[PDB]
Amino acid sequence: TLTYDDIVGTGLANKCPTLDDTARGAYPIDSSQTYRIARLCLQPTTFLVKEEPKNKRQEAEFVPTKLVTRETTSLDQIQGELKVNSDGSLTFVEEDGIDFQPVTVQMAGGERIPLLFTVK
Amino acid sequence: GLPWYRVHTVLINDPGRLIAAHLMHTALVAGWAGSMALYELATFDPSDPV
Ligand code: CLA
Ligand code: CLA
Ligand code: CLA
Ligand code: CLA
Ligand code: CLA
Ligand SMILES: CC1=C(/C=C/C(C)=C/C=C/C(C)=C/C=C/C=C(C)/C=C/C=C(C)/C=C/C2=C(C)CCCC2(C)C)C(C)(C)CCC1
Ligand SMILES: CC1=C(/C=C/C(C)=C/C=C/C(C)=C/C=C/C=C(C)/C=C/C=C(C)/C=C/C2=C(C)CCCC2(C)C)C(C)(C)CCC1
Ligand SMILES: [Ca+2]
């Protein structure tokens, strides 16, 4: 573990935790014991912006973009119940947390594309 | 003295100022090139090469 001071200014704070190459096991679900997610976290790596095919509809694809803002992208502290379903499936239901971050990215032309990257 | 259309004859045998002259010329032609570019970059639309 590292203290606040051990992260400040490094950019590490905008990074969701990681598991080692080992941890590739499996977690059990009692299906008779409620479960929740104590901490969901999402860290962006790429932001692609589908381009408008001009008038000539020719099918459009997503294109990479430069992150004009900085390392403020990550969503963290997400939380909610991970209820087990009748059919034996699992559904997560978020309650609260830093569930959104305003991101701004530039493109080929120079156009800034602001979005509200979220999972509310 | 010299007619207007002859003012540049003042260099016919002054290798120094003749070089000074062609240097200024080259400067203008290089200058134009640089700035004519910027004009195109400020108005050219890359949105569609087709
Ligand atoms: C082998 C030696 C040599 C070399 C390499 C040159 C080279 C050049 N001479 Mg030149 N010259 C020489 C001997 C030489 N001369 C002799 C013995 C005489 C008789 C005295 C002349 C008389 C002469 C005249 C009368 C003229 C030239 C011009 C030119 C230039 C025409 C191209 C240009 O303008 O580029 C410009 C674009 C470039 C890409 C920039 C190149 C500049 C370089 C990189 C900087 C060099 C810095 C250095 C300290 C100064 C030396 C300059 C030159 C003497 C090498 C060119 C750089 C013409 C000129 O000066 O036009 C402006 C010109 O009118 N020369
Ligand atoms: C290779 C390029 C070149 C060069 C270096 C020269 C150089 C020279 N010419 Mg000349 N000349 C050229 C091409 C060139 N000429 C061409 C193509 C023509 C036919 C159109 C002439 C016709 C010509 C005549 C009829 C005479 C000269 C004369 C002279 C000498 C005196 C210049 C003078 O004082 O003008 C003075 C210049 C001004 C005060 C007036 C310029 C106004 C111009 C017309 C308006 C346009 C300006 C604009 C920026 C030009 C754009 C350049 C364009 C090519 C991109 C000088 C040695 C004179 C000489 O022999 O004296 C005894 C002379 O009588 N030239
Ligand atoms: C390649 C460009 C060039 C160069 C290197 C020279 C170089 C020279 N000229 Mg010259 N000249 C040029 C173009 C050029 N001229 C043009 C286009 C004209 C008018 C047609 C003249 C008219 C002229 C005269 C009448 C005389 C010279 C003379 C001379 C010599 C002495 C320097 C002098 O006092 O200049 C004089 C300075 C000027 C006339 C230059 C100013 C004019 C320009 C248009 C100003 C540009 C301002 C701005 C950047 C653009 C315009 C703004 C507009 C868009 C609103 C020198 C060798 C003298 C010489 O020794 O003769 C014996 C002389 O008497 N020139
Ligand atoms: C390799 C191509 C080339 C050549 C051969 C020349 C040659 C010449 N340039 Mg030039 N120039 C070039 C490319 C070239 N340029 C480029 C790419 C640029 C950047 C746009 C310039 C910009 C430039 C400037 C700013 C000036 C010159 C001038 C001159 C002349 C100086 C010698 C002289 O005193 O003539 C005496 C003058 C002539 C005999 C006039 C020639 C008539 C031309 C060919 C026709 C165009 C003018 C026309 C009659 C009227 C149109 C006017 C317009 C403004 C509406 C010479 C004829 C200078 C000038 O001419 O001032 C005296 C000058 O000021 N050039
Ligand atoms: C540092 C050196 C340098 C370099 C690398 C460039 C590079 C470039 N310039 Mg450039 N330029 C320079 C100096 C330089 N310039 C200087 C000093 C001037 C002022 C005179 C200019 C003025 C200039 C203009 C006005 C323009 C460029 C342009 C360009 C671009 C297009 C190149 C082109 O197609 O050329 C074309 C090359 C030729 C004209 C062919 C020359 C061959 C001649 C005809 C033969 C000469 C006779 C020869 C002596 C016979 C003996 C040969 C022997 C082997 C048999 C290119 C990026 C263009 C551009 O797109 O704008 C940015 C453009 O419009 N330049
Ligand atoms: C000094 C210096 C500098 C700066 C520089 C600069 C900024 C420059 C600019 C330059 C420029 C910016 C130039 C320009 C030029 C232009 C020109 C030279 C033009 C010309 C034109 C013409 C001549 C035209 C004509 C015509 C007309 C008008 C119409 C009819 C047709 C024709 C085409 C004929 C620096 C900082 C780098 C550093 C070092 C020092
Ligand atoms: C003072 C000083 C100095 C400096 C000096 C110098 C170096 C100057 C220069 C100057 C210069 C060098 C200037 C220039 C000018 C220019 C001009 C005046 C231009 C004009 C142009 C134009 C007008 C353009 C046009 C166009 C258009 C419109 C579009 C098309 C294209 C083109 C671009 C052509 C020093 C450093 C010593 C130090 C101290 C201070
Ligand atoms: Ca667009």
CB pair distance less than 8 Å for B48 and A54: yes
CB pair distance less than 8 Å for B47 and A54: yes
Amino acid symbol at A72: T
* C-alpha dihedral sign at A100, A17, A91, A81: negative
Q: How far is CA A61 from CA A12, A58, A77, A95, A108, in A?
A: 32, 10, 33, 34, 14
Alpha carbon nearest to ligand 4 atom 21, residue: B29
Distance in angstroms (rounded) separating the CA atoms of residues A32 and A17: 29
H helices of chain A, in order, are: none
Distance in angstroms (rounded) separating the CA atoms of residues A75 and B49: 38
Over its C-alpha atoms, chain A yields an Rg (Å, rounded) of 19
Method used to solve the structure: X-ray
Resolution in A: 6.6
Q: For residue A114, list its beta bridge partners.
A: A104
With 0-12 CB in 10 A as exposed, 13-18 as middle and 19+ as buried, what is A104?
middle
Q: For residue A92, list its beta bridge partners.
A: A82
Q: How many CB atoms lie within 10 A of CB A65?
A: 19
By most ligand atoms within 8 Å of CB, the mutation choice from B13, B17, B19 for ligand 1 is B19
Q: Is A108 on the interface with B (CB under 8 A)?
A: yes
